Amino acid sequence: SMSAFSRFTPLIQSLFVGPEALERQHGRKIAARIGANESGFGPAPSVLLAIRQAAGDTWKYADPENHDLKQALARHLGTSPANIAIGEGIDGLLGQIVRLVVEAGAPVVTSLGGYPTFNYHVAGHGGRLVTVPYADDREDLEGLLAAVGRENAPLVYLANPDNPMGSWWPAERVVAFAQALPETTLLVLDEAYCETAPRDALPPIESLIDKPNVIRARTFSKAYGLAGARIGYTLSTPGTAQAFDKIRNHFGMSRIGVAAAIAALADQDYLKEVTLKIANSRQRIGRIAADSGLAPLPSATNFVAVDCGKDASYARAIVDRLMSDHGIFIRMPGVAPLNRCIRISTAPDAEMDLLAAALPEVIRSLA
Amino acid sequence: FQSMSAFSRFTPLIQSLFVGPEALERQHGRKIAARIGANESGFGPAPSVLLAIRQAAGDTWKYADPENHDLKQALARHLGTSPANIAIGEGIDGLLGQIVRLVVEAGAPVVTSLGGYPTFNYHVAGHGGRLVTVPYADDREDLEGLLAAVGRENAPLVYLANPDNPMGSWWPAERVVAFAQALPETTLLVLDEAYCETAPRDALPPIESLIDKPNVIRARTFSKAYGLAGARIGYTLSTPGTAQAFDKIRNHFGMSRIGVAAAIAALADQDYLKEVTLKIANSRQRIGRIAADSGLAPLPSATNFVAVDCGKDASYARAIVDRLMSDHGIFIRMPGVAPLNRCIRISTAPDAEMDLLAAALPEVIRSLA
Ligand SMILES: *Cc1c(COP(=O)(O)O)cnc(C)c1O
Numbered sequence: 001s002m003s004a005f006s007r008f009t010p011l012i013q014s015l016f017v018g019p020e021a022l023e024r025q026h027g028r029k030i031a032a033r034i035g036a037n038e039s040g041f042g043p044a045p046s047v048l049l050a051i052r053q054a055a056g057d058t059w060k061y062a063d064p065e066n067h068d069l070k071q072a073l074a075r076h077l078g079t080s081p082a083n084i085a086i087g088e089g090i091d092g093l094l095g096q097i098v099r100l101v102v103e104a105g106a107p108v109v110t111s112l113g114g115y116p117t118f119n120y121h122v123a124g125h126g127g128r129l130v131t132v133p134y135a136d137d138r139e140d141l142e143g144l145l146a147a148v149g150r151e152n153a154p155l156v157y158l159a160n161p162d163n164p165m166g167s168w169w170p171a172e173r174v175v176a177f178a179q180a181l182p183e184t185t186l187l188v189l190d191e192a193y194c195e196t197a198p199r200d201a202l203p204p205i206e207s208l209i210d211k212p213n214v215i216r217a218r219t220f221s222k223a224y225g226l227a228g229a230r231i232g233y234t235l236s237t238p239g240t241a242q243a244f245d246k247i248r249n250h251f252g253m254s255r256i257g258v259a260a261a262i263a264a265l266a267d268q269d270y271l272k273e274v275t276l277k278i279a280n281s282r283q284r285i286g287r288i289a290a291d292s293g294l295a296p297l298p299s300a301t302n303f304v305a306v307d308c309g310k311d312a313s314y315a316r317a318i319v320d321r322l323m324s325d326h327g328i329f330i331r332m333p334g335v336a337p338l339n340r341c342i343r344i345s346t347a348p349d350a351e352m353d354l355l356a357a358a359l360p361e362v363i364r365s366l367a
Numbered sequence: 368f369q370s371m372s373a374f375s376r377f378t379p380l381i382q383s384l385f386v387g388p389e390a391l392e393r394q395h396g397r398k399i400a401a402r403i404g405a406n407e408s409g410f411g412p413a414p415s416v417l418l419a420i421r422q423a424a425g426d427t428w429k430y431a432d433p434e435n436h437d438l439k440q441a442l443a444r445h446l447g448t449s450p451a452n453i454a455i456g457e458g459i460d461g462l463l464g465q466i467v468r469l470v471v472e473a474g475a476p477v478v479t480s481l482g483g484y485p486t487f488n489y490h491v492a493g494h495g496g497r498l499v500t501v502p503y504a505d506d507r508e509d510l511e512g513l514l515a516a517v518g519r520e521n522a523p524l525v526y527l528a529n530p531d532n533p534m535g536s537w538w539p540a541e542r543v544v545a546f547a548q549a550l551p552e553t554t555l556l557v558l559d560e561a562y563c564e565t566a567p568r569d570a571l572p573p574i575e576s577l578i579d580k581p582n583v584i585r586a587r588t589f590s591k592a593y594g595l596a597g598a599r600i601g602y603t604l605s606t607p608g609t610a611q612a613f614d615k616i617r618n619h620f621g622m623s624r625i626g627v628a629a630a631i632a633a634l635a636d637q638d639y640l641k642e643v644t645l646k647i648a649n650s651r652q653r654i655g656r657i658a659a660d661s662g663l664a665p666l667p668s669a670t671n672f673v674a675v676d677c678g679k680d681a682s683y684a685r686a687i688v689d690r691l692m693s694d695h696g697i698f699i700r701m702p703g704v705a706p707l708n709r710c711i712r713i714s715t716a717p718d719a720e721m722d723l724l725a726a727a728l729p730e731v732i733r734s735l736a
């Protein structure tokens with residue numbers, strides 16, 4: 001505005017619609033909230049109990065060392081807490097990673113149409129984004145490697161499994177990619193979808209944990225059902241993990257969120273149950289898509305990408321009509337040819353039943 | 368410094384770069400009996416806020432509204448201002464980091480008080496700013512000295528806390544407004560009002576006195592009187608253009624969904640806030656009595672703590688802090704620079720904690736003679 005402070009940095013001077021904003025725009029409530037990959041299955045009953053029990057302690061700051069959470073993670077994962085950093089979701093950690101490495105004008109390599117929050121952080125720190133097209137619906141490992149080399153980029157992003165296509169690579173291919181990078185380039189390996197992936201997609205911890213130039217990011221926001229709590233963590237060498245202590249808000253963690261995450265980790269039975277429900281919902285979405293003449297894509301995530309078989313304007317019309325006519329909130333990718341697709345999050349049966357009724361009608365109404 | 372296993376191409380700045388109570392419990396192998404060192408409000412948030420948290424628990428699978436619309440609307444109503452003037456962040460500490468990021472280029476001078484709020488200094492250093500520190504004047508942040516340092520350095524950023532941490536002192540609103548209006552319009556003032564709720568009304572500038580200034584931002588929190596430190600909810604008051612700059616560099620979905628619900632409920636329960644601010648005031652008086660009974664000198668306060676001059680040197684004050692913890696499980700803190708570090712800082716608390724402190728402090732002082 002004309003009212004802004006006149007001496008923001010030159011970078012600052014040069015610089016997704018959420019579901020609540022959609023409701024305000026459309027003047028209606030969302031009937032199926034299946035567009036942001038939030039887990040409507042919810043966190044475990046034991047986690048809800050832990051939150052309610054923790055409420056009375058919310059006057060205290062969280063432990064700035066995150067000791068109990070790091071220990072719990074370390075015990076679960078079979079690695080040391082010295083290898084672990086805690087942050088405000090993967091999104092918060094991604095911002096910190098960009099800050100740690102990216103100077104104004106530095107090139108940063110990612111996939112064309114890949115996870116947009118990463119791109120937001122890169123731009124906000126003055127990085128120059130270098131994008132690599134997907135190769136047959138997968139993030140192109142060989143192409144990412146070459147772009148890094150061409151630019152001598154200090155940072156590269158890979159999500160495995162991928163958002164928004166839901167695709168994945170075998171662990172051995174991801175490891176080979178990571179090992180091939182120059183040690184002067186940091187890889188952030190975004191494993192937001194660890195919990196829903198086939199085990200053979202995920203590198204063993206020991207395969208990468210000694211590399212100073214690899215950091216892996218995981219979250220409680222997806223399968224664990226705690227998106228609103230903002231708890232993420234990274235796995236790296238201890239020297240790389242320690243760097244977060246130079247630039248993090250030490251008391252920044254939500255005390256209730258940390259309690260919830262510790263409880264979530266403890267309830268592996270619930271995680272097993274919910275991941276089976278997510279898988280079932282992926283199959284249901286695939287059936288619904290196919291019944292409407294669309295092409296669902298294989299997925300290792302908590303959503304299904306669906307190829308709508310025409311162009312981007314058709315996919316957009318489907319998203320908009322689902323919201324306008326049925327109060328169904330989905331999303332779509334933002335670049336060709338990925339944007340031939342829509343992306344539908346998994347959900348309980350009530351939402352699936354609504355989607356099953358609505359999607360054919362939308363497709364019929366567009367013909 | 369960085370270790371041999373750290374990524375070898377962290378920025379040159381990065382390469383060049385308080386004990387919490389939980390760590391103290393681990394070190395001493397005991398639970399804290401009186402947690403009165405981090406200015407957390409042991410009075411707690413309102414009963415209605417606890418209910419709101421428990422009711423919101425089932426929705427925690429959803430991300431918070433990235434626009435923070437309902438919270439901004441609630442704050443706008445409470446404050447009597449436009450929601451366009453309001454930015455939301457992860458406490459004042461989170462907002463301070465953002466403010467530094469918005470203004471501070473490597474090497475830029477940033478003015479603050481010597482021994483003033485340390486998290487601000489942490490953020491400045493972390494963004495490559497050059498800290499320019501101004502000694503306190505008689506236990507107050509030296510407005511004249513801050514203004515001189517800004518002028519000398521043409522500093523783009525200056526920090527003022529009113530009321531102050533760690534001394535608890537304050538300036539009248541008219542002096543703060545005069546200070547703010549004397550700064551160059553090319554210098555941003557962050558006016559840290561963490562202690563708004565416990566301050567005398569005449570310490571606080573009216574919103575209208577500063578709200579049209581593009582170079583003033585005021586920061587407030589739910590962490591202190593409202594009893595929600597663990598929820599991490601802070602907000603700022605500024606012009607809309609200044610508020611909008613946060614949208615360029617903030618983690619849009621970063622807010623705790625339960626924390627937002629708690630903050631909205633906390634705002635609604637002004638009867639509870641009134642009650643708790645009176646309890647905090649009473650506890651300050653009790654701490655003053657306890658201090659005086661042990662031959663120490665409590666300082667006036669407009670915060671939720673009392674600074675106490677222990678009348679000797681920094682090593683004496685340190686010994687008091689350490690013995691209270693080791694021998695009695697009592698957690699307090701002290702300032703980190705002379706001559707402020709002649710002092711200890713004791714947070715307010717309910718009667719159970721005050722009673723423990725009243726028994727323990729004389730024993731500690733006696734043991735040190
Ligand atoms: C959902 C998601 C994130 C963000 O996770 P948070 O931990 O909630 O910040 C990051 N990366 C990918 C690929 C995601 O899908």
Ligand SMILES: *Cc1c(COP(=O)(O)O)cnc(C)c1O
Pocket residue numbers: 406457458459460461484528531532559561587588589590591596599600601
């Ligand atoms: C306690 C305190 C803060 C931190 O507040 P949060 O909102 O919890 O981040 C900031 N400034 C001062 C002066 C404080 O006393």
